[PDB]
């Protein structure tokens, strides 16, 4: 599960809403740990 | 991160070159569809 917001909330070009800033836990090298990763995704690759 | 403004990807085609290319295509289509047939081009409709 990703938690996402808009990358550029104040943008009026055709790119408004196209890039989302998503947060997720992922995995790490050791099975006991988790991390927090922030990354940008394109709207076309992410489903609500 | 985006190191500057967020801009949309795009492609440029010269208008005069395309207009001549398309006219040539129309002439070759007329050879199969008729000298007095109207040849219209339109964008793709359905699908992904």
């Amino acid at each position: 599960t990703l938690q996402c917001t808009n990358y550029a909330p104040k943008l009026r070009s055709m790119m408004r809403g196209e890039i989302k800033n998503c947060s997720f836990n992922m995995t790490t090298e050791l099975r006991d740990k988790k991390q927090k990763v922030y990354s940008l995704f394109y709207r076309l690759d992410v489903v609500q | 991160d985006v190191l500057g403004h967020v801009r949309m990807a795009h492609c440029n085609i010269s208008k005069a070159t395309w207009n001549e290319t398309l006219g040539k295509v129309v002439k070759q289509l007329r050879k199969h569809f008729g000298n007095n047939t109207i040849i219209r081009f339109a964008q793709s409709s359905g699908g992904d």
């Epitope: 909330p9 104040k10 009026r12 070009s13 055709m14 | 403004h5 801009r7 949309m8 795009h10």
Partner: antibody, heavy 128, light 104 residues
């Protein structure tokens, strides 16, 4: 670019006020918004309304809208504000101003930014 | 829009003037300065851009649903009313704060 304004100055209650904004060194037909702003001595800068310089589209202040008309004359590069039923609340300094649009990318893709009030005129003080 | 009615700072000290509203999620805060009796000017616009002619002391931030104008080491020439100006969410170009009275 410089902006200048003129008008009747003192009017009586229920009379209609007509203010004219003129420009120096510009052309109103550009893709810029032109606006009128009201500032009475005890308040801040309260927008009156605006008109698009290139298209004629207008917006108005909803509490004022029904009694205010804003128009532009492409000829002579001029704007005017027509305010009906002028009352004591209108004893304020009137300003004309222009917005501008900056460009960082492709114009046809909307890759522009707003700069809402780049140049201000000196304004005129009216009384009622 | 709501903003601090007044701020009092010693000469030579930095100030931070903050405005808040609902439309600031989608619009940038445009900071204006009006010295009493003078024509107002634009101080900060868009994505923290500075118009030519404004000293480097004036800068700001649009984080969250607020906007902040920071004047580093405020000078006597900066004594003016300051206003946080932005557009309304309906598209109407008016949403304007009461103004902050800055005394140095």
């Amino acid at each position: 670019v410089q902006l200048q304004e003129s008008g009747p100055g003192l009017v009586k209650p229920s009379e209609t006020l007509s203010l004219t904004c003129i420009v120096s060194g510009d052309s109103i037909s550009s893709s810029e918004w032109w606006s009128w702003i009201r500032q009475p001595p005890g308040k801040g800068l309260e927008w009156i309304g605006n008109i698009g310089g290139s298209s004629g589209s207008t917006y108005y202040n909803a509490s004022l809208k029904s009694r205010v008309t804003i128009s532009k004359d492409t000829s002579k590069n001029q704007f005017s504000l027509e305010l009906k039923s002028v009352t004591a609340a209108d004893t304020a300094v009137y300003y004309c101003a222009r917005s501008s649009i900056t460009i960082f990318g492709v114009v046809v893709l909307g890759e522009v930014e707003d700069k809402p009030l780049d140049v201000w005129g000196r304004g005129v003080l009216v009384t009622v | 829009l709501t903003q601090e009615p007044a701020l009092s700072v010693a000469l030579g000290h930095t100030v931070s003037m903050t405005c808040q509203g609902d439309s600031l999620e989608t619009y940038y805060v445009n900071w204006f300065q009006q010295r009493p009796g003078q024509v107002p000017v634009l101080v900060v616009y868009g994505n923290n851009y500075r118009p030519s002619g404004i000293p480097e002391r004036f800068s700001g931030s649009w984080s969250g649903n607020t906007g902040t104008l920071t004047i580093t080491a405020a000078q006597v020439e900066d004594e003016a009313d300051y206003y946080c100006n932005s557009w309304d969410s309906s598209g109407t170009h008016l949403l304007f704060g009461g103004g902050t009275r800055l005394t140095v």
